[PDB]
Paper text:
CYTOKININ RESPONSE1 (CRE1), the main cytokinin receptor, has a modular architecture composed of a cytokinin-binding CHASE (Cyclases/Histidine kinases Associated Sensory Extracellular) domain, followed by a transmembrane fragment, an intracellular histidine kinase (HK) domain, and a receiver domain (REC). Perception of cytokinin signaling involves (i) a hormone molecule binding to the CHASE domain, (ii) CRE1 autophosphorylation at a conserved His residue in the HK domain, followed by a phosphorelay to (iii) a conserved Asp residue in the REC domain, (iv) a histidine-containing phosphotransfer protein (HPt), and (v) a response regulator (RR). This work focuses on the crystal structures of the REC domain of CRE1 from the model plant Arabidopsis thaliana and from the model legume Medicago truncatula.
Residue numbers in the entry:
A (entry chain B): 916 to 1035
B (entry chain A): 916 to 1048
The structure:
């Protein structure tokens, strides 16, 4: 509960800056981190059984986005449930930062002066 | 005498709940509020010269979104500056909540267990230096 020692985290992101920064953040608390740059690579790493304890899922990726990739992880797990009678549920947290920042850049680009924080 | 007393706010939003909430809230601070359901209505209300002190701009609207409408509010001001030399710069604040809500609803629908709001900050950020050749 204080450190991530003994945990293995999958970071999926198609931005090399995100992959490097997330991994260093998680490694500073002792996580073993594996990075994937695409949904296909992530699905290949998540063949059941795998040893990952949690996954950070970039929602915006070409060819397969994070929603699709998640849908297929859940299909993989449902298949395993049916054939092994054990329930696999990898924790998956979406990484949305790049949808929100892109949104803020179009606001500024269009000429808006700011935005409402925690808006109406 | 309340905080926005004497101020007139244009709320542009195509969702009736936001219009009702934004306007009620702003009126409690003493603002006179006008609501618009579309960018075209907003552009019509912002004929220069106008009496609006601020504008809240829904970024996601059919037919004309808030970026477009903003883009044309700025052309109006630039045209005025060019032709009259008078400086108009309406304050425009983006309303982005419903884009974040939809994204968050899509995460749930796909099967994710949650989301990270704030991005990963890097540790030694202001610790970098400019090194000279
Ligand atoms: K991305
Ligand atoms: K909207």
């Amino acid at each position: 509960n204080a450190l991530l020692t003994g945990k293995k985290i999958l970071v999926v992101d198609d931005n090399i800056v995100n992959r490097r920064v997330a991994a260093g953040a998680l490694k500073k608390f002792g996580a073993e981190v594996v990075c994937a740059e695409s949904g296909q690579v992530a699905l290949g790493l998540l063949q059941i059984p795998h040893t990952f304890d949690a996954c950070f899922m970039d929602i915006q990726m070409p060819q397969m986005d994070g929603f699709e990739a998640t849908r297929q992880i859940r299909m993989m797990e449902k298949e395993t449930k049916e054939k092994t009678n054990l329930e696999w549920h990898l924790p998956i947290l979406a990484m949305t930062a790049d949808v929100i920042h892109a949104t803020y850049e179009e606001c500024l680009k269009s000429g808006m002066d700011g935005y409402v924080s925690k808006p109406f």
